[PDB]
């Protein structure tokens, strides 16, 4: 803060000498720096007080990523197969033995089950 003017008059906010006869938005910035074009840039980084406070001048805080390696805005574990939580693309249930199939049994209670030629094909 290091105020020394504080106000030109009304002595609890932002606007110094020189900065109270300027539409100068409470505690956004200074009328030397403070623009249509600059508003983020002065002398706050956001609703509380001062760029002048945390690494990075106050950086804003995201919600992290659902991976704890990837660290940085991006995706989620349905967009990430990289996580041994999720399904791998391998050993899925598929179709097998792709060929003909055996013949049935017709054989008159002779030679197997009961079918063919009866009249003829027996014996006793
Ligand atoms: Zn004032
Ligand atoms: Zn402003
Ligand atoms: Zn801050
Ligand atoms: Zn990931
Ligand atoms: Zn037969």
């Known amino acids: 803060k290091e105020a020394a003017p504080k106000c030109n008059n009304c002595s609890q906010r932002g606007h110094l000498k020189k900065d109270c006869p300027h539409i100068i938005c409470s505690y956004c910035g200074a009328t030397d720096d403070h623009y249509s074009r600059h508003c983020p840039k002065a002398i706050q980084c956001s ?3 001062e760029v002048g406070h945390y690494r990075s001048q106050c950086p804003h805080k995201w919600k992290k990523v659902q991976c704890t390696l990837c660290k940085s805005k991006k995706h989620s574990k349905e967009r990430c197969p990289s996580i041994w939580r999720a399904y791998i693309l391998v050993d899925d ?27 003829d094909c027996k014996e006793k």
Do not use: R, S
């Not at 055996?102 to 008159?108: E, K, N, R, V």
């Not at 030679?111 to 030629?117: E, L, S, V």
């Open 93 to 119: 249930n598929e179709k097998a033995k792709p060929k003909v199939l055996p013949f049935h049994t017709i054989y008159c209670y002779n030679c197997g089950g009961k079918g063919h030629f009866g009249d």
């Open 47 to 49: 609703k509380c007080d």
